[PDB]
């Protein structure tokens, strides 16, 4: 049984557990055991929770940030359903009471014992919340569809729970002996050394003696910093390059081991290739020992030298600048450091940036202020997670402050908290403990944590860290491990099926290619693997029976698969589809869609609903991911083709979109579609401007039959080819109800763009803090300060609300000027 679990994890994580043992590392071995225990302890607490508390794990409530409606309800062991006229203000218990009141008349005779399951979905309806607050009910009101729910008893939820069971005395300066190398290049070679505490230096960078292109230096390189002054999170960064400048390779390492002891003596560093000094990069060597260039160094002995315990550390014009700074200004903040904790605790970040980390006595005083520092708000704590604040206790302080995070707020920032793991120095950290703990406390969190980690196993620098985390998770959840295995098996067949489609497309016609996709899918192994799975894009969405006859592929370069599903239990709710893309990177798209999804949350938090389409996007592997099918939608280009035999026969190209909406929304339905279009058009106008999405043609802009506009293929963001505001004549025509002159509908639309832009500006720091944590991701279009600077300009944070709104009106008028 124990062997089975081991081999099952290996396949799921895509890296055999034998590999972890084959390294024979104490850090790897200590992580695996300490975390297994923590995960198994968390699995035990889960097995004793109540049936309602279990639902909070297995099926977390999807909640939104008077008027009666028709609702259909049925029981578990029957087909007979009941239709009720219940209000939006009604609690699920009142609906549960109605279901038991209409059962007592049919069966001829307590709501607290039940839970309402969503038909063919891993979503539930429970708690003291009105029906209209539920995301499932809320969607059914706008679309007009009838909600289908199932009455599930406490004993059946408990049946699910059971079947799912498992020192300062060192005044000498710092030095290293740069022995030899084992590189290959074609000139002289220099080795640059630097001591770092985050993004900034501890002492000036020292270069080596110029040696010709297997080189031997054998030189002791000294640094302008004492051994006793060296902070706990001190990083020794190297850069091997060639000069007559050409970068070859880079390599960094911690001065203290995971056991806090200062490192001595000999070390072989397997260097990572280059594009000069990179402090952000990993502290572990290139696992390609076969072809990786080595850097042999010696750490001169001082004798055990463990870093001092916290008890030893603890024993040892102002307001105007508080809204990059001069030296006198930095001294001022360090001078009145006690007054900062008392009156401005939220300014901790600026105080942590001015402290001299290269002076151990300044660090001790700072840590004493930190150990009595009151809990920072989630927002302020998100800034502390950045590489700018590397200290272990500072990292611990951020986690401690982030513990107040809701499962809904954590789901919005999970991607950033996963990418921040790349900044980490040691395997066992306060972040991983938090990420694993929250994952084993909420199944939806654990689902996305796994997928964010898995999709990056192909990246060698994070393959060891992520593989170890996923292993620990599977110890804490054996059932979910088997659930995610079904998802991994489905994605395996999809890659093979797509590989055939890519070959076939270059050899024969699409009708014959599509027919041989169906033949490949209708095979037992394909049929079984591609069916009855939780959607990796959303665990609550169940992809049951695969609708092979409706499966096709897209005509774009990498031939993306179009996989449709069907459900008996759900009906129309189970008529969901997925897109399997292979060959392109879906990381930027995921990022852009999460940023757009947040804007929509922040708009709904101020009352405004701009009818945004936050369709799922998830990279699942090596240039491989999934995209959620937006049903009953089409591109501007496919709508504007003005093809014959169709109900939308337009005379002018501007009338194409409006005529399309006329056939899809008749008479009194068209009026709703225009407002749906106008709000989404306004929503995406601000979103694309703020995020800086360029090259927006008719092929990457889509419309829903409801009128709703959305954007696809986010290939280039942050104006990385500055981009202006975009307005199309075809859209203004739809907004103005199909009239050449209608200022009333245009000014009401101009009001939506203004309201949306002003809201975002207030949360402008939130977008900055998250995009800065996303610099860790290694995205080619988000790697420097000039990328982050785009938002500070597009949102205009430095200016006031009156100046920023006026400057926005300047950009909006230029978009209408460019509009023919």
Ligand X SMILES: Cn1nc(-c2cnc(N)c(-c3ccc(C(N)=O)cc3)n2)nc1C1(c2ccccc2)CC1
Q: Catalog residues that contact ligand X under the rule CB under 6 A.
A: 552, 554, 562, 579, 589, 615, 627-630, 633-635, 638, 712-713
Residues 518 and 553: their CA atoms lie apart, in Å, by 11
End-to-end CA distance of the chain: 70
Q: How far is the CB of 501 from ligand X (least distance, A)?
A: 12
Q: Is 331 helix (H, G, I), strand (E, B) or coil?
A: helix
> Tokens 């939308």 map to which residue?
648
Please, which residue, 223 or 580, has the CB nearer to ligand X?
580
Q: Are 783 and 775 in contact (CB under 8 A)?
A: yes
Q: How far is the CB of 513 from ligand X (least distance, A)?
A: 12
Copy the structure tokens of residue 583: 């060959």
What phi and psi values does residue 217 have, to the nearest 5 degrees? -100, -50
Please, which residue, 419 or 588, has the CB nearer to ligand X?
588
Residues 479 and 477: their CA atoms lie apart, in Å, by 6
Residues 361 and 228: their CA atoms lie apart, in Å, by 10
Please report the sign of the dihedral spanned by the C-alpha atoms of residue 236, residue 428, residue 309, residue 357: positive
Please, which residue, 477 or 620, has the CB nearer to ligand X?
620
Q: Are 699 and 637 in contact (CB under 8 A)?
A: yes
Q: How far is the CB of 542 from ligand X (least distance, A)?
A: 19
Q: How far is the CB of 554 from ligand X (least distance, A)?
A: 5
Q: How far is the CB of 514 from ligand X (least distance, A)?
A: 9
Please, which residue, 130 or 614, has the CB nearer to ligand X?
614
Copy the structure tokens of residue 741: 């002159």
Q: How far is the CB of 27 from ligand X (least distance, A)?
A: 39
Please, which residue, 106 or 554, has the CB nearer to ligand X?
554
DSSP string covering 567-635, please? BTTTBTTT--EEEEEESS--HHHHHHHHHHHHHHHHHHTTT---------EEEEETTEEEEE--TTEEE
Q: Which CA distances in Å does 111 have to 93, 94, 138? A: 6, 8, 23
Crossing angle of helices 430-439 and 407-419, in 10° steps, is 140
Residues 777 and 432: their CA atoms lie apart, in Å, by 17
Q: How far is the CB of 484 from ligand X (least distance, A)?
A: 23
Please, which residue, 422 or 452, has the CB nearer to ligand X?
452
Please, which residue, 207 or 638, has the CB nearer to ligand X?
638
Please, which residue, 60 or 619, has the CB nearer to ligand X?
619
Please, which residue, 20 or 580, has the CB nearer to ligand X?
580
Q: How far is the CB of 695 from ligand X (least distance, A)?
A: 13
Q: Tell me which DSSP letter residue 140 carries.
A: H
Please, which residue, 474 or 563, has the CB nearer to ligand X?
563
Q: Are 452 and 446 in contact (CB under 8 A)?
A: no
Q: How far is the CB of 562 from ligand X (least distance, A)?
A: 4
Please, which residue, 629 or 776, has the CB nearer to ligand X?
629
3-state secondary structure 35-59: HHHHHHHHHHHHHHCCHHHHHHHHC
Number of helical H runs and strand E runs in the chain: 31, 27
Please report the sign of the dihedral spanned by the C-alpha atoms of residue 147, residue 148, residue 154, residue 159: negative
Residues 213 and 218: their CA atoms lie apart, in Å, by 16
Q: Are 538 and 123 in contact (CB under 8 A)?
A: no
Q: Is 128 helix (H, G, I), strand (E, B) or coil?
A: coil
Please, which residue, 410 or 564, has the CB nearer to ligand X?
564
Please, which residue, 603 or 615, has the CB nearer to ligand X?
615
Q: Tell me which DSSP letter residue 134 carries.
A: B
Q: How far is the CB of 647 from ligand X (least distance, A)?
A: 17
Please, which residue, 149 or 612, has the CB nearer to ligand X?
612
Q: How far is the CB of 608 from ligand X (least distance, A)?
A: 24
Please, which residue, 189 or 712, has the CB nearer to ligand X?
712
Please, which residue, 149 or 782, has the CB nearer to ligand X?
782
Q: Are 618 and 579 in contact (CB under 8 A)?
A: no
> Tokens 């600048």 map to which residue?
321
Q: How far is the CB of 756 from ligand X (least distance, A)?
A: 22
Q: How far is the CB of 332 from ligand X (least distance, A)?
A: 50
Pairing label, strands 272-273, 266-270: unpaired
Please, which residue, 615 or 790, has the CB nearer to ligand X?
615
> Tokens 């923590």 map to which residue?
38
Q: Identify any residues that bridge with 633 across adjacent strands, giving them in sequence order.
A: 704
Q: Return the closest-CA partner of residue 455 out of 591, 554, 558, 632.
A: 591
Q: How far is the CB of 405 from ligand X (least distance, A)?
A: 29
Q: Return the closest-CA partner of residue 114 out of 92, 136, 147.
A: 92
Crossing angle of helices 2-13 and 478-505, in 10° steps, is 40
Measure the CA angle with vertex 61, ends 57 and 66; round to 5°: 155
DSSP string covering 489-528, please? HHHHHHHHHHHHHHHHHTTS-HHHHHHHHHHHHTSHHHHH
Greatest CA span in the chain, whole angstroms? 96
Q: How far is the CB of 777 from ligand X (least distance, A)?
A: 18
Q: How far is the CB of 714 from ligand X (least distance, A)?
A: 7
Please, which residue, 420 or 629, has the CB nearer to ligand X?
629
Instruction: Kindly give the residue spans of alpha helices, DSSP state H, lying in 420-507.
Output: 430-439, 443-454, 460-476, 478-505
Q: How far is the CB of 625 from ligand X (least distance, A)?
A: 9
Q: How far is the CB of 120 from ligand X (least distance, A)?
A: 20
Burial-class residue 144 by CB neighbours within 10 Å (0-12, 13-18, 19+).
exposed
């Amino acid at each position: 049984v124990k062997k089975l679990i081991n081999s099952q994890i290996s396949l799921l994580i895509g890296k055999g557990l034998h590999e972890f043992d084959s390294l024979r590392d104490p850090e790897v071995n200590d992580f695996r055991t300490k975390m297994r225990q923590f995960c198994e302890e968390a699995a035990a607490h889960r097995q004793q929770l109540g049936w309602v508390e279990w639902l909070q794990y297995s099926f977390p409530l999807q909640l939104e940030p008077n008027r009666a409606l028709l609702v259909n309800v049925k029981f578990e062991g029957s087909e007979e359903s009941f239709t009720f006229q219940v209000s939006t203000k009604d609690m699920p218990l009142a609906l549960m009471a109605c279901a038991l009141r209409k059962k007592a008349t049919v069966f001829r005779q307590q709501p607290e014992e039940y839970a309402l399951q969503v038909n063919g979905r891993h979503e539930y309806l429970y708690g003291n919340y009105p029906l209209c607050h539920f995301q499932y009910i809320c969607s059914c009101l706008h679309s007009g569809l009838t909600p289908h729910l199932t009455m599930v008893h406490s004993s059946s939820i408990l049946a699910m729970r059971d079947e799912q069971s498992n020192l300062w005395s060192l005044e000498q300066p710092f030095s290293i002996e740069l022995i030899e190398g084992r590189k290959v290049n074609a000139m002289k070679l220099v080795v640059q050394a630097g001591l770092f505490h985050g993004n900034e230096m501890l002492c000036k960078t020292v270069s080596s003696s110029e040696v010709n292109v297997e080189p031997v230096w054998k030189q002791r390189l000294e640094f302008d910093i004492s051994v006793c002054d060296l902070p706990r999170m001190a990083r020794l960064c190297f850069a091997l390059y060639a000069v007559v400048d050409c970068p070859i390779a880079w390599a960094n390492l911690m001065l203290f081991d995971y056991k806090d002891q200062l490192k001595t003596g000999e070390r072989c560093l397997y260097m990572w290739p280059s594009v000069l000094l990179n402090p952000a990069g990993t502290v572990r060597g290139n696992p390609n020992t076969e072809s990786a260039a080595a850097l042999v160094i010696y750490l001169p002995e001082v004798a055990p030298v463990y870093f001092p315990a916290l008890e030893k550390i603890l024993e040892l014009l102002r307001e105007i600048l508080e809204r990059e700074l001069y030296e006198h200004e930095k001294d001022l903040v360090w001078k009145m450091r006690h007054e900062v904790q008392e009156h401005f605790p939220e300014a901790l970040a600026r105080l942590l940036l001015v402290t001299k980390w290269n002076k151990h006595e300044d660090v001790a005083q700072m840590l004493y202020l930190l150990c009595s520092w009151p809990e920072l708000p989630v927002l302020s704590a998100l800034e502390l997670l950045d590489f700018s604040f590397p200290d272990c206790y500072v990292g611990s302080f951020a986690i401690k402050s982030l513990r107040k995070l809701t499962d809904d707020e954590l789901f919005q920032y999970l991607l950033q908290l996963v990418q921040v793991l790349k900044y980490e120095s040691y395997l066992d950290c306060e972040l991983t403990k938090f990420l694993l703990g929250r994952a084993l406390a909420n199944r939806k969190i654990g689902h996305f944590l796994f997928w964010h980690l898995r999709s990056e196993m192909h990246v060698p620098s994070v393959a060891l860290r992520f593989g170890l985390i996923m292993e620990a998770y599977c110890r804490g959840s054996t059932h979910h491990m088997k659930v995610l295995m079904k998802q991994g098996e489905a994605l395996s067949k999809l890659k093979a099926l797509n590989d055939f489609v890519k070959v076939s497309s270059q050899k024969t016609t699409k009708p014959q290619t599509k027919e041989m996709m169906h033949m490949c899918m209708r095979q037992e192994t394909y049929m079984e693997a591609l069916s009855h799975l939780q959607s990796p894009l959303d665990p609550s969405t169940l992809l049951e029976e695969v609708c092979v006859e409706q499966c096709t592929f897209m005509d774009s370069k990498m031939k993306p698969l179009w996989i449709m599903y069907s459900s008996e239990e759900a009906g129309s709710a189970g008529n969901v589809g997925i897109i399997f893309k292979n060959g392109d990177d879906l990381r930027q798209d995921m990022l852009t869609l999460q940023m757009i999804q947040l804007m929509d949350v922040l708009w709904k938090q101020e009352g405004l609903d701009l009818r945004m389409t936050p369709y799922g996007c998830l990279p699942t592997g090596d240039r491989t991911g999934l995209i959620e099918v937006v049903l009953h939608s089409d591109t501007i280009a496919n709508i504007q083709l003005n093809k014959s035999n169709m109900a939308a026969t337009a005379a002018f190209n501007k009338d194409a979109l409006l005529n399309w909406l006329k056939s899809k929304n008749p008479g009194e339905a068209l009026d709703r579609a225009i407002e749906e279009f106008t709000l989404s058009c306004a929503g995406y106008c601000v979103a694309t401007y703020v995020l800086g999405i360029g090259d927006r043609h008719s092929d990457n802009i889509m419309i829903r039959e409801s009128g709703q506009l959305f954007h696809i293929d986010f290939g280039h963001f942050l104006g990385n080819f500055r981009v202006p505001f975009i307005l199309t004549y075809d859209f203004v025509h739809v907004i103005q109800q199909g009239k050449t002159n209608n200022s009333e509908k245009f000014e009401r639309f101009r009001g939506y763009c203004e309201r949306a832009y002003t809201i975002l500006r207030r949360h402008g720091l939130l977008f900055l803090h998250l995009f800065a944590l996303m610099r860790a991701a290694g995205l080619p279009e988000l790697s420097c300060s000039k990328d982050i600077q785009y938002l500070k300009d597009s949102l205009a944070l430095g200016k006031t609300e009156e100046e920023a709104l006026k400057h926005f009106r300047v950009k909006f008028n230029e978009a209408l000027r460019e509009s023919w």
